[PDB]
Structures are given as C-alpha cells and as structure tokens.
Amino acid sequence: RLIHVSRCEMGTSTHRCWPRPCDTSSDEPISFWPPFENTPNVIVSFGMLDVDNSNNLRVNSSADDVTVGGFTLHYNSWYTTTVWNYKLIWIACD
Amino acid sequence: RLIHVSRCEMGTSTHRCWPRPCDTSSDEPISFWPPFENTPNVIVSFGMLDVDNSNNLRVNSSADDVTVGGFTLHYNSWYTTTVWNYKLIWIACD
Amino acid sequence: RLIHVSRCEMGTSTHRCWPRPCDTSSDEPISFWPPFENTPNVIVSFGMLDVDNSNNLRVNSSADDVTVGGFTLHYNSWYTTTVWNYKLIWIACD
Amino acid sequence: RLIHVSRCEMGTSTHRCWPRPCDTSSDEPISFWPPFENTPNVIVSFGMLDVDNSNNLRVNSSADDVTVGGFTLHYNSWYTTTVWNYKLIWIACD
Amino acid sequence: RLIHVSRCEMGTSTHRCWPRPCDTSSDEPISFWPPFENTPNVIVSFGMLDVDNSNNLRVNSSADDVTVGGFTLHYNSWYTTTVWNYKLIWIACD
Amino acid sequence: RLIHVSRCEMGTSTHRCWPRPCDTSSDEPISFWPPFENTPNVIVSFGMLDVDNSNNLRVNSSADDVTVGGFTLHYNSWYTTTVWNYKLIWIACD
Ligand SMILES: CC(=O)N[C@H]1[C@@H](O[C@H]2[C@@H](O)[C@@H](CO)O[C@@H](O[C@H]3[C@@H](O)[C@@H](CO)O[C@H](O[C@@H]4[C@H](O)[C@@H](O)[C@H](O)O[C@@H]4CO)[C@@H]3O)[C@@H]2NC(C)=O)O[C@H](CO)[C@H](O)[C@@H]1O
Ligand SMILES: CC(=O)N[C@H]1[C@@H](O[C@H]2[C@@H](O)[C@@H](CO)O[C@@H](O[C@H]3[C@@H](O)[C@@H](CO)O[C@H](O[C@@H]4[C@H](O)[C@@H](O)[C@H](O)O[C@@H]4CO)[C@@H]3O)[C@@H]2NC(C)=O)O[C@H](CO)[C@H](O)[C@@H]1O
Ligand SMILES: CC(=O)N[C@H]1[C@@H](O[C@H]2[C@@H](O)[C@@H](CO)O[C@@H](O[C@H]3[C@@H](O)[C@@H](CO)O[C@H](O[C@@H]4[C@H](O)[C@@H](O)[C@H](O)O[C@@H]4CO)[C@@H]3O)[C@@H]2NC(C)=O)O[C@H](CO)[C@H](O)[C@@H]1O
Ligand SMILES: CC(=O)N[C@H]1[C@@H](O[C@H]2[C@@H](O)[C@@H](CO)O[C@@H](O[C@H]3[C@@H](O)[C@@H](CO)O[C@H](O[C@@H]4[C@H](O)[C@@H](O)[C@H](O)O[C@@H]4CO)[C@@H]3O)[C@@H]2NC(C)=O)O[C@H](CO)[C@H](O)[C@@H]1O
Ligand SMILES: CC(=O)N[C@H]1[C@@H](O[C@H]2[C@@H](O)[C@@H](CO)O[C@@H](O[C@H]3[C@@H](O)[C@@H](CO)O[C@H](O[C@@H]4[C@H](O)[C@@H](O)[C@H](O)O[C@@H]4CO)[C@@H]3O)[C@@H]2NC(C)=O)O[C@H](CO)[C@H](O)[C@@H]1O
Ligand SMILES: *[C@@H]1O[C@H](CO)[C@@H](O[C@@H]2O[C@H](CO)[C@@H](O)[C@H](O)[C@H]2NC(C)=O)[C@H](O)[C@H]1NC(C)=O
Numbered sequence: 001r002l003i004h005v006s007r008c009e010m011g012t013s014t015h016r017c018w019p020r021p022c023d024t025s026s027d028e029p030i031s032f033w034p035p036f037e038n039t040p041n042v043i044v045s046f047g048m049l050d051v052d053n054s055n056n057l058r059v060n061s062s063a064d065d066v067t068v069g070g071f072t073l074h075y076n077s078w079y080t081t082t083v084w085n086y087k088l089i090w091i092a093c094d
Numbered sequence: 095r096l097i098h099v100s101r102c103e104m105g106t107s108t109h110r111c112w113p114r115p116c117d118t119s120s121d122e123p124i125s126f127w128p129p130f131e132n133t134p135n136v137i138v139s140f141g142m143l144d145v146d147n148s149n150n151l152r153v154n155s156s157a158d159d160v161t162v163g164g165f166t167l168h169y170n171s172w173y174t175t176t177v178w179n180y181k182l183i184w185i186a187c188d
Numbered sequence: 189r190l191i192h193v194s195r196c197e198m199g200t201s202t203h204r205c206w207p208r209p210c211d212t213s214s215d216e217p218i219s220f221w222p223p224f225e226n227t228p229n230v231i232v233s234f235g236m237l238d239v240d241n242s243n244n245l246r247v248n249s250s251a252d253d254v255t256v257g258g259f260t261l262h263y264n265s266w267y268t269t270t271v272w273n274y275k276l277i278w279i280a281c282d
Numbered sequence: 283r284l285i286h287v288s289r290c291e292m293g294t295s296t297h298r299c300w301p302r303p304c305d306t307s308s309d310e311p312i313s314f315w316p317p318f319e320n321t322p323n324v325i326v327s328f329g330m331l332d333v334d335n336s337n338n339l340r341v342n343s344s345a346d347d348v349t350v351g352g353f354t355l356h357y358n359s360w361y362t363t364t365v366w367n368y369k370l371i372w373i374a375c376d
Numbered sequence: 377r378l379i380h381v382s383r384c385e386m387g388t389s390t391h392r393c394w395p396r397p398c399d400t401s402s403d404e405p406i407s408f409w410p411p412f413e414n415t416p417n418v419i420v421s422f423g424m425l426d427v428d429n430s431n432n433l434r435v436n437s438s439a440d441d442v443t444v445g446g447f448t449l450h451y452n453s454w455y456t457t458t459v460w461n462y463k464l465i466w467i468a469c470d
Numbered sequence: 471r472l473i474h475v476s477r478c479e480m481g482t483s484t485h486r487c488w489p490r491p492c493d494t495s496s497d498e499p500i501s502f503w504p505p506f507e508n509t510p511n512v513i514v515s516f517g518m519l520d521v522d523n524s525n526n527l528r529v530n531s532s533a534d535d536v537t538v539g540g541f542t543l544h545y546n547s548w549y550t551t552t553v554w555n556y557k558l559i560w561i562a563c564d
C-alpha cells in the first residue's frame with residue numbers, strides 16, 4: 001500500500017568559548033551519509049545557551065543551503081549582544 | 095511483520111517586529127496535508143530569539159488544538175517583558 | 189528493497205516554580221514504550237523559558253543515558269542565573 | 283515521504299483423497315488476522331497435483347469474496363476429470 | 377534505521393479458448409504504476425489448467441523483459457501438446 | 471506508528487532432463503542473504519511442467535527445513551509418473 005514514512009537524522013553542535021566570547025557567527029558542514037532521496041526539511045534550535053545580561057539577547061540559528069547530501073549548520077548573534085557558550089541542536093527528516 | 099515508523103512534518107514561523115515590539119501573544123493555524131491517520135504529537139521551540147534585557151525573559155510557545163488535521167502554533171510572552179523578534183519551530187510525528 | 193525509515197518518540201516536561209526559583213538542576217526519567225530496536229538519538233530544547241534579567245542567562249539541557257527503553261531528561265542552570273518557569277521538549281528517532 | 287510497502291500473508295492447503303477422488307469442487311474460508319488495512323489481492327496456484335490420465339486435466343483455483351479480513355480458497359474441476367490429490371498454495375498482499 | 381521491506385504487485389490472466397484450442401504462445405504486457413525504485417523479481421505459475429491427455433502435458437510460463445516499469449507475461453506450450461483453457465498468476469516484489 | 475510490512479524473497483529453479491527423465495526427487499538448498507529477522511513463510515509451485523501422459527500426473531513440491539537463513543526446495547513425483555522437464559517457483563515473505 002502507499003504510506004508515509006520519514007527518515008530522520010539529528011545531532012548537536014556544542015560551543016563553549018568562555019572565558020573568550022563566541023564568534024558573531026559560525027557555520028558547520030553537516031552531512032547525511034547516505035544522502036536522502038529528496039531534500040529533507042531541517043530545523044535548528046538551542047539546547048544550551050549562555051547570554052550576558054549586559055545586552056539584549058539576540059541569538060539566531062538556522063539550516064542554510066540544505067542539500068540532499070547535507071546542510072550548513074548556521075548560528076549568529078547581532079548588535080551589542082554577547083554569547084558565552086551555546087549548544088545547537090538540529091533534526092532533518094523527509 | 096509489525097514495525098514502528100513515524101511520519102513527521104515540520105516548519106518554522108518567523109516574526110520580525112523591530113522597531114515595533116512583537117504582539118504579546120500569537121496563534122497561527124497550521125494545516126497538515128495530507129491529514130494524519132491518527133493525532134500526532136508536536137513539540138515547539140525557538141530557532142531565533144531577540145528579547146530586551148530591560149526586563150525578564152518570558153517566552154512561551156506551544157502547539158494547541160492538535161488533531162489529525164493540524165494544530166495551532168501558539169506563542170506568547172507575559173508580564174512586563176518585550177520581544178523584538180523570534181522564530182518558532184515545530185515538528186509533528188505520528 | 190532496503191530502505192531507511194524511523195520511529196520517533198517525543199514529549200514535553202513543564203516546570204513552573206515561581207514564585208519559587210526553579211531548582212539548579214532537575215532530572216526526569218523517560219520510558220520508550222515499546223523499546224526501540226536499537227538505541228535512539230535524542231535532542232532536547234526549550235519550549236518555554238522564564239529567566240531573570242538580574243544575571244546572565246544560563247540554561248542547559250540534554251538526554252542522558254539514552255537506552256532502547258528510555259533516556260534521562262536533564263535540565264540545569266549554573267552559577268548566579270535564576271529561572272522561574274520553563275518547558276523542555278525532546279524528540280527521539282531510530 | 284511516500285513509499286510503497288506491502289504486507290503479505292500466505293498459506294497452503296493439502297487435500298489427500300486417494301484411494302478416493304477429490305470432490306468436484308472445494309471451498310475453504312481463510313482468515314487474515316489481524317485484518318488488513320486495505321482489501322488485498324490474492325493469487326492461488328498449485329503446489330502439488332495428482333490427476334488421472336484417464337481423462338483430461340481440468341483444474342481451476344481462485345480467491346473468492348476477498349475481504350480485508352480473509353477470503354474463500356476455491357478449487358474445482360469439471361466434466362470427466364479425476365483428481366486424486368492436490369495442494370493449493372495462495373499468497374495475498376496489499 | 378535500515379530495514380527490509382518489499383513492494384509487491386500481482387495479477388492473473390485468464391485464457392478460455394475452448395472449443396477453440398489455445399494459441400501455442402501468448403505474451404502479455406504487464407506494467408507497474410508507479411514503477412519500482414529498482415528492478416523487481418517476478419515469478420509465474422498456473423491457476424487453472426485444461427490440457428488434453430491425448431498428448432503430454434507441456435506448459436511453460438515466465439516473466440520476460442522484466443524492468444522497473446513492468447514485464448511480459450509469457451506463456452507457451454510446445455510439440456504435441458494441446459491446452460484448452462488456462463490462467464496464469466504472477467507476483468512481483470522488490 | 472505501528473504498521474505491517476513484509477520482506478519477500480523469491481526465485482525459480484529449472485530442471486531440463488529430456489530425453490533423460492527427471493529424477494524422482496530433487497532437493498535444492500536456498501539461502502536468505504541477509505537472514506530474515508524471524509522465520510518466514512514459503513510456498514512453492516510449478517512454473518513449467520512437462521509430464522508424460524502414459525501415467526497419472528503425480529507431482530509435488532514444497533519448502534522444507536525453513537529457517538531464517540534459508541530453506542530446502544523440495545520436489546518429487548511418485549509411483550508410475552514420468553516427468554521430462556519442470557520449473558519450480560518460490561516466494562518467501564515474513
Ligand atoms: C543594527 C542592530 O543590530 N540593531 C538592533 C538593536 O537595535 C538598537 C540599535 O538600532 C541602536 C542604534 O544606536 O538603537 C537602539 O535604540 C535606542 C536608540 O534609539 C537610543 C538613542 O538615544 O535611544 C534608546 O535607547 C536609550 C539609550 O541609548 C540606552 O543606552 C538606554 O539604556 O536606554 C535609552 C532608552 O531606550 C533606544 O532604545 C536599538 N534598540 C532597540 C531596542 O530598538 O537591537 C534591537 C533589539 O535588540 C534589534 O535587534 C536591532 O536590529
Ligand atoms: C503577573 C505576572 O506576569 N507576573 C510575573 C512576574 O512576577 C512579578 C510580578 O508579580 C510583580 C508584581 O508587582 O512582582 C514581582 O516581584 C517583585 C516585588 O515583590 C517587588 C516589591 O518591592 O520586589 C521585587 O522587585 C523589586 C521591584 O519591584 C523592581 O521594580 C526592582 O527592579 O527590583 C526589586 C527587587 O527585585 C520582586 O521581584 C514579580 N517578580 C518576581 C521575580 O517574582 O515575573 C515572574 C518571573 O519573571 C513570573 O513570570 C510572574 O508570573
Ligand atoms: C563558575 C561559573 O558558573 N562561572 C560562570 C560565570 O562566570 C563568572 C564567574 O567566573 C565570576 C567569578 O567571580 O567571574 C565573572 O567575571 C567577572 C569578574 O572577574 C568580575 C570581578 O570584578 O569582573 C568582571 O565583572 C564586572 C562586574 O563584577 C560585574 O558586576 C559587571 O556587570 O561587569 C563587570 C565586567 O564584566 C568579570 O566579568 C564571570 N563572568 C563572566 C562574564 O565570565 O558566567 C560565565 C558566563 O555567564 C560562565 O557561564 C562561567 O562558567
Ligand atoms: C461440459 C464440459 O465440462 N465440457 C468440457 C469438455 O468438453 C468435452 C464435452 O463437451 C464433450 C460432450 O460430449 O464433447 C467433447 O468433444 C468430443 C466430441 O465432439 C466427440 C464426438 O464424437 O468427438 C471427440 O471425442 C471423441 C469421443 O467423444 C471420445 O470419447 C474419444 O475418446 O475421443 C474422440 C475423439 O476426440 C471430441 O473431443 C468435449 N471435448 C473437447 C476436447 O472439447 O472438455 C473440454 C476440454 O477438456 C472443456 O473443458 C469442456 O468445457
Ligand atoms: C503407491 C502409489 O504411488 N500409488 C499411487 C497410485 O495408485 C495406484 C497403485 O496403488 C496401484 C497398485 O497396483 O493400484 C492402482 O489402482 C488400480 C488397481 O486396483 C488395478 C488392478 O486391476 O485396477 C485399476 O486399474 C485398472 C488398470 O490396471 C489400469 O491399467 C487402467 O488404466 O485402469 C483400470 C481402472 O483403474 C485401479 O485403478 C492405483 N491407482 C489408483 C487410480 O488408485 O496412483 C494414485 C493416483 O495417481 C495415488 O497417487 C497412489 O498413491
Ligand atoms: C538567521 O540566519 C539566517 C541565515 O543567514 C538569515 O537569513 C537571511 O535573512 C535575510 C532577511 O531576514 C535575507 O535577506 C537573506 O537572504 C537570508 N539568508 C539566506 C540566503 O538564507 C536571517 O536573517 C538570520 N536572522 C537574524 C535576525 O540574523
């Protein structure tokens with residue numbers, strides 16, 4: 001019969017830059033071995049966050065350039081915001 | 095034989111309000127196509143968060159009124175808090 | 189034919205503490221019913237969060253001792269940070 | 283994603299009659315259990331056969347009144363044929 | 377996770393020729409909608425048979441030119457044989 | 471979700487003895503690579519049959535010694551029957 005099933009892969013990228021500050025941005029090459037049949041959907045979020053109250057909390061995360069073979073794990077803060085340590089989590093299913 | 099397998103859907107919903115503050119609360123109808131054969135589960139979180147340090151960080155997000163047809167992507171803040179931008183993420187499996 | 193498919197179990201854990209500050213750390217055992225063929229993968233994030241601006245934001249979370257029958261839903265803050273309410277969300281797939 | 287996967291059920295049914303000839307036709311209700319989700323196809327054939335050369339070889343078999351919960355395994359012969367033994371084999375997938 | 381599942385298709389082709397005798401051979405086009413990811417395996421047999429004892433029983437059948445799109449349901453006899461009526465059954469799975 | 475899926479395997483062994491008559495019995499060992507998770511169901515039938523009319527048609531076939539790793543492809547005739555050529559077909563799903 002015809003049915004719906006999803007293949008999923010997931011992981012966590014961790015960043016501990018303290019005492020140093022974590023970079024404005026960061027991009028990681030995440031690959032799916034083996035590739036998917038079609039380009040899956042991916043969502044990213046935070047599992048651990050270390051933000052200084054001396055400035056507004058501005059943390060953005062995302063999956064950019066999603067290829068059936070992998071995707072770019074993207075993170076960035078902006079303006080005067082300062083991030084000390086942070087863990088990203090992502091899950092891509094199809 | 096019998097096996098376990100899930101069908102998962104997933105999406106994001108970006109709310110950029112700056113220079114205006116984001117609505118205190120938000121509810122968006124999300125539709126599943128095609129409908130699940132049985133009610134699915136749904137977890138919601140944040141992929142991007144921009145909140146003013148002028149006050150405590152009070153952000154809530156959920157999936158209310160879930161069914162086989164879909165759910166309501168609910169988000170809200172409370173008290174004297176202020177959010178300039180935020181991205182909600184969700185995933186629903188069965 | 190040989191294919192890839194998954195089984196995803198997921199959920200949420202709400203911790204309301206205000207007016208009492210939430211515990212520095214909190215562990216919660218989760219059970220997979222029935223058990224997975226093999227050891228799944230879990231990722232935990234936040235779905236709600238209430239953090240005091242009087243200090244930096246320091247929230248961490250993870251899935252510990254993940255077995256075919258369950259994992260431990262871990263939460264913790266550190267140092268001077270304070271938390272009033274929060275919701276954890278996790279999802280596992282094989 | 284969408285995939286095509288089938289569930290199959292299959293069985294044999296031996297009929298030994300000799301020294302007596304097997305009855306002109308024979309019907310036997312088969313039960314799928316648990317029931318099927320869709321109404322499946324079924325094909326019947328012969329795994330063993332013992333027929334008399336004294337006449338032509340006239341044998342017929344078929345799945346009948348197929349539900350999502352079973353069907354009638356049917357066998358028969360017409361006219362002057364004489365069958366001494368036979369085993370029906372059947373397979374039903376979806 | 378990696379599992380083995382199969383997709384199967386099946387069907388029958390009834391040939392009632394009496395009083396006329398059945399053609400020596402028959403090749404029928406069977407197609408698959410939609411086609412397989414990869415080329416299936418196919419097997420054929422007889423569901424009903426009507427062979428004249430005046431001569432030896434000789435029946436052959438097979439799936440020819442099998443591809444992801446379908447195949448050719450071939451049937452034939454040879455030499456002195458005579459077949460009055462007959463049905464073929466086939467099932468393909470990948 | 472819980473669903474039903476079968477994994478199948480199939481094949482056909484041919485035997486061309488004319489003018490030599492085919493042995494009374496034959497047993498071919500079949501392997502299942504990779505080995506089913508749990509013991510499968512097998513069914514065998516005739517894809518090509520060539521029998522001399524000078525005696526009753528007595529043919530039999532089956533799958534014996536069925537294990538998750540394989541099975542034995544059994545075939546025989548008995549008493550006065552004489553078989554010149556024949557082909558067996560088998561399909562085993564779990
Ligand atoms: C480009 C960027 O990343 N901007 C993000 C940032 O917005 C802030 C900036 O645009 C700065 C530019 O100087 O302006 C902030 O608004 C300020 C100014 O208009 C200021 C000028 O006097 O007045 C207000 O702030 C004053 C004072 O400057 C502060 O030191 C004092 O503590 O508070 C005063 C009263 O507020 C005004 O707020 C922008 N800030 C806000 C809020 O819009 O951050 C926002 C939100 O985090 C967005 O992310 C921008 O993209
Ligand atoms: C209804 C709601 O959304 N409440 C959420 C909020 O709780 C705060 C409110 O209940 C306000 C009501 O006035 O009280 C806060 O507690 C205060 C007061 O007890 C106050 C009295 O002096 O003392 C503390 O704060 C003072 C002063 O008020 C502040 O302006 C000053 O900057 O700092 C002082 C020292 O702290 C005390 O905090 C409630 N706040 C807390 C914390 O309990 O926010 C909480 C957490 O974010 C919950 O979300 C409530 O539901
Ligand atoms: C163990 C732990 O959980 N540490 C986490 C914490 O780090 C802070 C602590 O290590 C404290 C220990 O006293 O030091 C902080 O750095 C401070 C101090 O050196 C301080 C002494 O005067 O000077 C700086 O801070 C001043 C002032 O004290 C503040 O009130 C003012 O607002 O800012 C000033 C300039 O920053 C210095 O920053 C550590 N803080 C930081 C930042 O590193 O928190 C961090 C980040 O949240 C990590 O999580 C640590 O593990
Ligand atoms: C109703 C049914 O099941 N019929 C199936 C059967 O058909 C045979 C019957 O229709 C009988 C009815 O009497 O006729 C057979 O044809 C015969 C006659 O035309 C006959 C007249 O002389 O000539 C042939 O046979 C003779 C003689 O009758 C035999 O006893 C003798 O051994 O041989 C002679 C020479 O053949 C002729 O065959 C029908 N037979 C055939 C063949 O059509 O069987 C057929 C095929 O098995 C179908 O299944 C019918 O439905
Ligand atoms: C052990 C075995 O494999 N037997 C299978 C076989 O059965 C036949 C045998 O048991 C023989 C043993 O001698 O008997 C057959 O029955 C015959 C005899 O009773 C015979 C004695 O006169 O009478 C009948 O046969 C005559 C004549 O001999 C034949 O030449 C003529 O064509 O027909 C006449 C009338 O039948 C009688 O049939 C057994 N045959 C039958 C039929 O029972 O074959 C059967 C069916 O194929 C089973 O497979 C047995 O297991
Ligand atoms: C979060 O990261 C994404 C990835 O860079 C940012 O996406 C860009 O968004 C702007 C407008 O919002 C577009 O003009 C760009 O085309 C996007 N980049 C691409 C090609 O993906 C997003 O802006 C970031 N959010 C914040 C607040 O920094």
Ligand SMILES: *[C@@H]1O[C@H](CO)[C@@H](O[C@@H]2O[C@H](CO)[C@@H](O)[C@H](O)[C@H]2NC(C)=O)[C@H](O)[C@H]1NC(C)=O
Nearest residue numbers: 154155156157158159168169170171172236273
């Ligand atoms: C987060 O959002 C959810 C949904 O809006 C809130 O849940 C509601 O809780 C109240 C408790 O008094 C119920 O009356 C509502 O019916 C609930 N909504 C439903 C059915 O989803 C939750 O309280 C919010 N949390 C915070 C901190 O604001």
Ligand SMILES: *[C@@H]1O[C@H](CO)[C@@H](O[C@@H]2O[C@H](CO)[C@@H](O)[C@H](O)[C@H]2NC(C)=O)[C@H](O)[C@H]1NC(C)=O
Nearest residue numbers: 048085247248249250251252253262264265266
């Ligand atoms: C977040 O919580 C996890 C779980 O308690 C912490 O993980 C431990 O990390 C240390 C090294 O820092 C390892 O030696 C332990 O094996 C880990 N524990 C377990 C049971 O996984 C993690 O360190 C915490 N991070 C923060 C920011 O506090």
Ligand SMILES: *[C@@H]1O[C@H](CO)[C@@H](O[C@@H]2O[C@H](CO)[C@@H](O)[C@H](O)[C@H]2NC(C)=O)[C@H](O)[C@H]1NC(C)=O
Nearest residue numbers: 341342343344345346347356358359360424461
């Ligand atoms: C073989 O068996 C099938 C199943 O009993 C027979 O099917 C009947 O076919 C006739 C016409 O072909 C229909 O009018 C009947 O309604 C069918 N029966 C039902 C209820 O399915 C078929 O006739 C048999 N063929 C032979 C040669 O005996």
Ligand SMILES: *[C@@H]1O[C@H](CO)[C@@H](O[C@@H]2O[C@H](CO)[C@@H](O)[C@H](O)[C@H]2NC(C)=O)[C@H](O)[C@H]1NC(C)=O
Nearest residue numbers: 436437438439440441450451452453454518555
């Ligand atoms: C049964 O039918 C098959 C298919 O027509 C026959 O196999 C063909 O045999 C010829 C030579 O004898 C080859 O050139 C073809 O390539 C074969 N077809 C394929 C692709 O399988 C087979 O000979 C027939 N058997 C009998 C006894 O008639």
Ligand SMILES: *[C@@H]1O[C@H](CO)[C@@H](O[C@@H]2O[C@H](CO)[C@@H](O)[C@H](O)[C@H]2NC(C)=O)[C@H](O)[C@H]1NC(C)=O
Nearest residue numbers: 330367529530531532533534544545546547548
């Ligand atoms: C058809 O083949 C089967 C399999 O060989 C035969 O059944 C076996 O018969 C022998 C002798 O009675 C037993 O020792 C085995 O246990 C049987 N196997 C099983 C479990 O089926 C069957 O008798 C054959 N039929 C004919 C007509 O020869």
Ligand SMILES: OC[C@H]1O[C@H](O)[C@H](O)[C@@H](O)[C@H]1O
Nearest residue numbers: 432434455488520521522554
């Ligand atoms: O049955 C005996 C024998 O009759 C002829 O020789 C055919 O060519 C063979 O295929 C076989 O059918």
